[PDB]
Amino acid sequence: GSALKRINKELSDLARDPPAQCSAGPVGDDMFHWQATIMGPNDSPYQGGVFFLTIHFPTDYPFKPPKVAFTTRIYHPNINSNGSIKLDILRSQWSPALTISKVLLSICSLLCDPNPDDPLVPEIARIYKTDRDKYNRISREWTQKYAMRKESYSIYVYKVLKQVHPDTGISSKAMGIMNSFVNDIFERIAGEASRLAHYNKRSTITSREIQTAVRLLLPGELAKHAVSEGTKAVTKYTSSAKAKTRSSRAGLQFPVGRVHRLLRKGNYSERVGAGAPVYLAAVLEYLTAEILELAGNAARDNKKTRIIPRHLQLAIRNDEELNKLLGRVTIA
């Protein structure tokens, strides 16, 4: 679609020469929903703070303006508690010629030079005009008080397979599918968790939002066992000593740090608790163990010692719950 491609080009343009004091990227695999971070302009009382914004592209982009709003509380004549930004380009003076990079730069200038004559919060716009010292001081108070290549898991898939079926291998084509399953589950769970975080106005994704997403997106026994594996992992991670590896502290084969990084890298939320990646990592490992156990069992009926894409198709189709989860994923 034109909207998508236009969005993808701006990202490419933004990626090469990012805007000063700014950065933006999609949320998960959703190109129509971005997260943006602005470093406190040096020529402003907001210096030192990191402000988080949300961006939503309409279907008719670039012929319609993007919906931009602050998720971090800020004190400004043109920004209200809803994060709404009164800026001419955002609504009145939209043009397809503008870019998200230009928008963000126009917002930065707005923080350096407010427009108190066309205000969104009158009290702030009055304090700004009559007592600039009071405005600058409160701004810093708020700044201080509020603004402070598909992934591959071949090793861990291999490690789980060695636990479940020590004498069964997996072809390269079968391993690629595994990576597709793990990445899809990651995207869908994280995506939902992000939704829940924004929905309830939470700046940190914790194991709480990871569990609710699992309980909602996984069917029947898969969800019940998944929730059990995620809980057992988070319990072991808290009690276990700090000296050993995050994955080891949770008794998992999958990498917590990598998941934790991806949780941040994906812009699913402003922050990500330390429990969240453990929970998701445990959930990812369990499903991998389930899929690999069935596939290997499938490779055995045909007297094969190496899982191939066919045995993966079979293991999913033979299990009602898994097929409900992995039906859409392609299997060549």
Curated annotation (Swiss-Prot):
Effect of residue 78 to S: Activity is restricted HECT-type and not RING-containing E3 ubiquitin-protein ligases. Exhibits ubiquitin transfer with ARIH1 and PRKN
EC number from the UniProt entry: 2.3.2.23, 2.3.2.24
The UBC core domain, residue ranges: 3-148
MF terms (GO), sorted A to Z: ATP binding; ubiquitin conjugating enzyme activity; ubiquitin protein ligase activity; ubiquitin-protein transferase activity
Mutagenesis or variant effect for residue 88 to E/P: Has intermediate lysine reactivity
Post-translational modification, as annotated: Phosphorylated by AURKB.
Reported impact of residue 88 to K: Abolishes affect lysine reactivity
Active site residues according to the UniProt entry: 86
Primary location recorded for the protein, binned into one broad class: membrane
Enzyme kind, highest EC tier: transferase
Short name of one Pfam family: UQ_con
Reactions it catalyzes: S-ubiquitinyl-[E1 ubiquitin-activating enzyme]-L-cysteine + [E2 ubiquitin-conjugating enzyme]-L-cysteine = [E1 ubiquitin-activating enzyme]-L-cysteine + S-ubiquitinyl-[E2 ubiquitin-conjugating enzyme]-L-cysteine; S-ubiquitinyl-[E1 ubiquitin-activating enzyme]-L-cysteine + [acceptor protein]-L-lysine = [E1 ubiquitin-activating enzyme]-L-cysteine + N(6)-monoubiquitinyl-[acceptor protein]-L-lysine
SUPFAM superfamilies linked: UBC-like (SSF54495)
Metabolic or biological pathway: Protein modification; protein ubiquitination
Subunit structure, interactors included: Interacts with SCF (SKP1-CUL1-F-box protein) E3 ubiquitin ligase complex; when Cullin is neddylated, the interaction between the E2 and the SCF complex is strengthened. Interacts with DAPK3. Interacts with BRCA1; the DNA damage checkpoint promotes the association with BRCA1 after ionizing radiation. Interacts non-covalently with ubiquitin. Interacts with E3 ubiquitin-protein ligase CBLC. Interacts with UBTD1. Interacts with RIGI and RNF135; involved in RIGI ubiquitination and activation.
Protein name: Ubiquitin-conjugating enzyme E2 D3
Species classification: Eukaryota, Metazoa, Chordata, Craniata, Vertebrata
